[PDB]
Amino acid sequence: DLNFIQVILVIFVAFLAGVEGILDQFHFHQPVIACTLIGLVTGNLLPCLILGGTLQMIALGWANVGAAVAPDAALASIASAIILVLGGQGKAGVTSAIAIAVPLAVAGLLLTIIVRTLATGIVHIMDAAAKEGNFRKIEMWQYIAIIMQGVRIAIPAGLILAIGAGPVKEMLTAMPVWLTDGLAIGGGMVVAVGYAMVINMMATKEVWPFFAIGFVLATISQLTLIGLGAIGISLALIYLALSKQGSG
């Protein structure tokens, strides 16, 4: 079981992961670091390290771009690690925790968006502080916002630790095969949204043909992705050299 020192340490690690989810500076929020810390403070170290390596492989390409924000690997890692410690099955629950991470990652994305939307009141209070020229209120409220971004993940962790090992083991054993299978399939379709958003940011009548050429060339499986990129750069350079002559 988990004693008082262990639960406090778990909670503070979760809070720091919530802080680093948006701070994006020390990257405790990464699956390897977060799962390692949770396993170290719970006593079940190696299963947590293995799980964190697995999620980091899963979550290699999640990086917030502009207003677009990734599915919050901090909550996914923290919640998967806590599932993994409380449910038992050190190396056996690796697959179950990895399966539960992705919807938990989407839930963390929702939570971080809700928090970033609530941060407008903080920015407005800072506007007022600028109107009155107080540095201290700025510092206090910035600390306060960092605190709520940490508690954004410290809270789901607290509620999960509130739900004892009994019911979490029951939920882990009461998982239909089709639920996990369909969740994996749905996770395998997600990148369509991101590709569509990038295309929408890039698509013009002058570039749709190049999209078609690249898409059709992807069907020759001997060509490698580096080779496809080389073909793309070559077409781009030829097009620019020709269009510069075209302009004059």
């Binding site: 390897v32 390290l49 492989m57 989407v106 997600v190 570039v207 496809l228 990129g229 793309g232």
Partner: protein, 300 residues
């Protein structure tokens, strides 16, 4: 006169880690930006009107990749030091140089730090962690933090020492060409990734025609010993079907048209729905549920 000492620059360094503290959607990183500049605004101006002027100035819209903001930090510090010591800079060069630097540095930082160095360091750490070596997360934290701290401090010092004499030689006659080549390359590679990384595969079978003689190998007349394998391999190489039934799936019917047709359809639908003001969280949750149902219906 109002020269900034090394201590205040180091304090700005330490405070820049919280550059993403507030992160509202209206003004993106103005909270952390203004927080990083509090020592500068303290040490430069002492009147109540001037502190309010600086704070209202630095609560305006700011966003970039948080690591590559350090050269902006330095140029901003140089401009504000000039403003404090007397220079006709009036709300137009502070914001002007700031906004000029936000864009291109974000577009050069998002690849370097997010999608190029972070995933390689993460892959190394993940391979190490799954191999049972504790050295994975340790190496990851050490390397990423060393890279970040060195880059941020050195870039801040350069941005301070270089003044606003870097952006003058930043004419926009070439960024157009860079963007256009970028768009050509990106559209090509995104077509390739649509075909190759988005898997929309259908399971159900369609046709199971029963083949005539001479189509399948018919493992009854095969020789017994050191010649059966020979004849089996020759009949396989000539194209005879290894079974007396030919299986045709809907995936094969789509693939006969073009590989990745369903993936392209989903990509187009996501583009159309995002254009139609659908929050991508709803689209992704709906995609998860769609996967759940289509696997329940034995489609995917």
């Amino acid at each position: 006169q109002l020269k900034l000492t090394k201590k205040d620059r180091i304090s700005v360094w330490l405070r820049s880690t919280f550059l993403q503290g507030s992160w509202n959607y209206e003004r993106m990183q103005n909270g952390g930006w203004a927080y990083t500049l509090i020592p500068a605004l303290k040490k430069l101006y002492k009147t109540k009107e001037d502190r309010s002027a600086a704070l209202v100035r630095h609560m305006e819209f700011f966003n970039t990749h948080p690591y590559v903001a350090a050269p902006i930090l330095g140029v901003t510090l140089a401009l504000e030091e000039e403003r404090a010591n007397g220079a006709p800079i009036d709300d137009v060069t502070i914001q002007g140089v700031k906004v000029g630097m936000m864009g291109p540095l974000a577009g050069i930082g998002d690849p370097v730090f997010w999608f190029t160095v972070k995933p390689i360091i993460g892959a190394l750490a993940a391979s190490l962690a799954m191999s049972g070596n504790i050295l994975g997360p340790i190496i990851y934290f050490v390397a990423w933090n060393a890279i970040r701290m060195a880059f941020t401090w050195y870039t801040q010092e350069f941005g301070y020492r270089a003044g606003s004499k870097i952006t003058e030689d930043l004419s926009g006659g070439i960024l157009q060409d860079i963007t256009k080549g970028a768009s050509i390359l990106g559209m090509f590679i995104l077509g390739s990734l649509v075909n190759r990384w988005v898997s929309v595969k259908f399971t159900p079978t369609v046709s199971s025609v029963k083949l005539d003689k001479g189509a399948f190998i018919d493992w009854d007349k095969l020789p017994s010993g050191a010649k059966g394998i020979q004849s089996a391999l020759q009949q396989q190489a000539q194209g005879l079907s290894l079974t007396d039934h030919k299986i045709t799936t809907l995936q094969d019917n789509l693939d006969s048209l073009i590989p990745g047709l369903a993936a392209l359809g989903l990509t187009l639908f996501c583009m159309w729905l995002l254009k139609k003001k659908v929050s991508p969280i709803v689209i992704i949750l709906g995609l998860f549920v769609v996967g759940i149902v289509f696997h329940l219906l034995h489609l995917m």
